[PDB]
Amino acid sequence: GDQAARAILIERNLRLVVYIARKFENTGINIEDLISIGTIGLIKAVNTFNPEKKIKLATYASRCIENEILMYLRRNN
Amino acid sequence: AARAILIERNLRLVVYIARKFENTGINIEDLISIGTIGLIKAVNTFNPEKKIKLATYASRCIENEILMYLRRNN
Amino acid sequence: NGDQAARAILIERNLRLVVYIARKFENTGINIEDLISIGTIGLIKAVNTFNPEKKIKLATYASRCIENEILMYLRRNN
Amino acid sequence: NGDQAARAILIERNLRLVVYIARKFENTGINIEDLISIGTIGLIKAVNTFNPEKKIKLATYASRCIENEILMYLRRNNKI
Amino acid sequence: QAARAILIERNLRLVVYIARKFENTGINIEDLISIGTIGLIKAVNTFNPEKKIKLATYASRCIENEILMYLRRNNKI
Amino acid sequence: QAARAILIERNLRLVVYIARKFENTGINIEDLISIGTIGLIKAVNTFNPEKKIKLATYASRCIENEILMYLRRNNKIR
């Protein structure tokens, strides 16, 4: 029910995870870790997104994906 | 924490399972993302008293998530 | 129930959706007749559980439920 | 009641629907007068349960309720 | 009640007998039967299984009243 | 544990067999399969095994009834 609704929104924004993950890729930071971590942020975005406000999902998701990655990068120096 | 330890410690498992689907021609980046969803489902639904190890249960959930995604779109 | 009369209207209005989706799974050598039946079950579940004041259209939600029912049928029989 | 006035407006607005649907079911052994009354009960139920927040016309919804009352009446009286 | 349905269905003829006495207007008998049936439903929903007035007489009044109010609302009787 | 899908899957060809009976009705078979399936769903949800009637017997009655109601409602020859 609610699960299927979130799956639709998650799967439509997967490329957004990759796009942001590639920005943070460089020496020592493996892209495959960043895709996973970023995907976690996308899941958090879809679960907390409020469609009754004027921020589009892709913009709110971008913020959550970045945030998840930055906190991973700070946790692992 | 706790759950976040289990997830971060098994990110490589997603890559290992996703590479099994190389011959589908589907972008490995998308499979990894899809498989990560499977890994997060496995952690959220484990129950350690069922006598099944978390790595094997997660292997199933990761492979299954990818399989459903591939058949849903083929 | 008046709710069931409304659900019946939206199910019958969208039987074509079951066919359009069922026909995509024809390469998985299962009879189209079975796929329509299984897909219809997913349409019934969609209309029964759809939340109209959420932001997902009925056709989008029902396509997901029709797919999910077929995919569960394919995984049970493989 | 204000809500009674609103329901009255909607019932009277769709009485043509009762007659048209009843005429479709008129047959030998089935009195049109009975079908109009039975159909009118279906219309009353439609207006009392209709939800405008959904995406179904009242007329679409009413006609379904009208048909359903007439069908159950014919099944109940063994006129299938 | 489930017994409401029985009371209504076997008083359907009552609606016709009353509605037929108003077909000296310019309103179709079909609409009068529909309106009278509203009067019958109102009577059954507001009937007391007692008192010195019982179903048939109370239903006749409500059926006639609804038809009268429908015709007066459209400026006939 | 609650998987009643064994019952439903076992009666799918019953839907097609009944829907083929209306070959002479000008309704596409795809619609009749869906409508019949609705009938099978109602059968399994209201089947009483304590009564003396087999499920496939009761299921056929609801499958055919669902189709007949759909055809009457749409003014099609039965």
Residue numbers in the entry:
A (entry chain B): -2 to 74
B (entry chain C): 1 to 74
C (entry chain D): -3 to 74
D (entry chain A): -3 to 76
E (entry chain F): 0 to 76
F (entry chain E): 0 to 77
From the paper:
The vast majority of σ factors are members of the σ70 protein superfamily, which is subdivided into four classes based upon their extent of conservation and the presence/absence of the conserved σ domains (σ1.1, σ2, σ3, and σ4 connected by flexible loop regions) that mediate interactions with RNAP and/or promoter DNA.
Here we present an experimentally solved X-ray crystal structure of SigE residues 17–133 and review all of the available experimentally-solved and AlphaFold-predicted B. subtilis sigma factor structures. Initially we produced almost full-length B. subtilis SigE (residues 17–239, only missing the initial prosequence that maintains SigE in an inactive state before processing), but we found that it degraded to a smaller domain that remained stable over time, as observed by SDS-PAGE and 2D NMR. The constructs used in this study lack the first 17 residues as this maintains activity in vivo without requiring processing by SpoIIGA.
